[PDB]
Amino acid sequence: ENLWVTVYYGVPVWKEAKTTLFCASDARAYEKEVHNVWATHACVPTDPSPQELVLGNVTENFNMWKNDMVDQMHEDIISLWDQSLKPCVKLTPLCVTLICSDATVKTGTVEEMKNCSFNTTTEIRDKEKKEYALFYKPDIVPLSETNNTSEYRLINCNTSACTQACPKVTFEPIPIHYCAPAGYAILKCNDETFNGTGPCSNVSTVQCTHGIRPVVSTQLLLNGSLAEKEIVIRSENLTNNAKIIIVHLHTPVEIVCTRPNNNTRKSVRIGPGQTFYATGDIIGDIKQAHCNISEEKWNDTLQKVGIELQKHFPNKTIKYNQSAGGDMEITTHSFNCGGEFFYCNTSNLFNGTYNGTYISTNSSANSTSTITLQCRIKQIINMWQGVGRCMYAPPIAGNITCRSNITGLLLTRDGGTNSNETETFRPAGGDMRDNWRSELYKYKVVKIEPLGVAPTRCKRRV
């Protein structure tokens, strides 16, 4: 009849709250003696164990957009990137007046480079000698209003200074496992049909998250996670057209790009014990870098995405249009491969329409059909804002191959007008937060309140 209080310690209770996470990586990175990414320097050896234990009967609410883990990841990446460039040579005695002329290689001529000569200080503090180097046109700007075509300057000294990245450090994306500290737990939504906001009927508990690729892209998503069952569309709200729509893929799409120019490096020593690398002569026939995608696979993926999007807009057909344009860094597909930054144009890719009439591509009349894109290259890079944006990417000898996979897309609604029957979508990039939020939607962090109270038919013995 009568009941009395009793205190329980260790009762499992979850409370969503903010906290900090740790990073771990496989021990293969630690094998390298030095100059192997940043995971070996900034993260711990990991362990797949324990397995993702599944709870019997639980209910929870998951929110993707209203999360702070992505902000923490962005801050950590920014801090690591800023710290990594501290010891590398920062240059500065290189923005002198450059005398540039048309590039004339022994094998022919190239329009994307200019042969700029300038004076540089030798090992002696006060002594100058002439030197030459080939520079890409986007990194070259006219000096002053005086229309003297023989004078030019780097695109610098108007915003901030610059620094050269070390050569022994690579930008390859190593997967990072984000683990939680003790006293907190990571809950994972196991449902593969989750829209992005809402509850999940199958929630598991995980020690550390799976691999996460810290990649950089604007329009498309490079190699990474894959959908489990079928294509899923995630968006903050369809009422507002300014929001970014992230589209996943059931199967990947191969992509391969290359630059056969076969460049070679020079070695110019300026100051005490520090050198600056630049492209010199070019050996072999002059050609153009390019990118390659398969046509039938892309069309099938586009049709699948269209039929999946027809549910939200059944009264309207689907069409695709060229990007907004403007600056190169905004409208162009910007990515990195082997330390070389590529800016591709997607005008030839996003051009099509679909009115609900599915077309089968099983004929396979010509399996070798493909779609080709032309791309440009830049050395000066402004990755982010107010982080010391300017960075110099040194060249690499030989010609490279950048075979990779595509598993996601970023789309944006266009401003409707006149109740048009064919409202379109456009590619549109932005901050890396959108890129990093697509791979952390499953995970949530909770705090444990082990203390609890309950009544029972018991009393304390005196």
Binding site: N2, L3, W4, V5, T6, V7, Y8, Y9, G10, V11, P12, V13, W14, T19, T20, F22, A42, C43, V44, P50, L53, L55, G56, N57, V58, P181, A182, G183, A185, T205, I448, E449, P450, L451, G452, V453, A454, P455, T456, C458, K459, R460, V462
Partner: protein, 132 residues
């Protein structure tokens, strides 16, 4: 079920079950409260970890008059105004999460009363032992 034998239920394998079944195997939840290794200032900042919250819990439990990280029955009467619910509906078919959600509004008064009840009992026992 709870009759596995050698317990390997993980950190939170018993969550969402009945109170009676979940009453056992509470040791694993409390034991797993330590991990991490050094990297930078922020890692050591976070490495305070449960050392502060565990000490908070130990202080609260010891002040109430309980030794050992297990159950502990007190003598404070259970005022029915807080819940006024049937015993069976709570201790047989209800989990801890929703129970805590329901009873989250009456935490300060019970802790305050338990703080002084133990001191009163200790003083009474001291007087009884000193009388002889």
């Amino acid at each position: 079920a709870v009759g596995i034998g050698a317990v390997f239920l993980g950190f939170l394998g018993a969550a969402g079950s009945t109170m009676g079944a979940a009453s056992m195997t509470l040791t694993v939840q409390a034991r797993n409260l330590l991990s991490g290794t050094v990297w930078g200032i922020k890692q050591l900042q976070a490495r305070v970890l449960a050392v502060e919250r565990y000490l908070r819990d130990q202080q609260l439990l010891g002040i109430w008059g309980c030794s050992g990280k297990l159950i502990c029955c007190t003598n404070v009467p259970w005022n029915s105004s807080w819940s006024n619910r049937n015993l069976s509906e709570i201790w047989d078919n209800m989990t801890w999460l929703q129970w805590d959600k329901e009873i989250s509004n009456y935490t300060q008064i019970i802790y305050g009363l338990l703080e002084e009840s133990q001191n009163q009992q200790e003083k009474n026992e001291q007087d009884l032992l000193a009388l002889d």
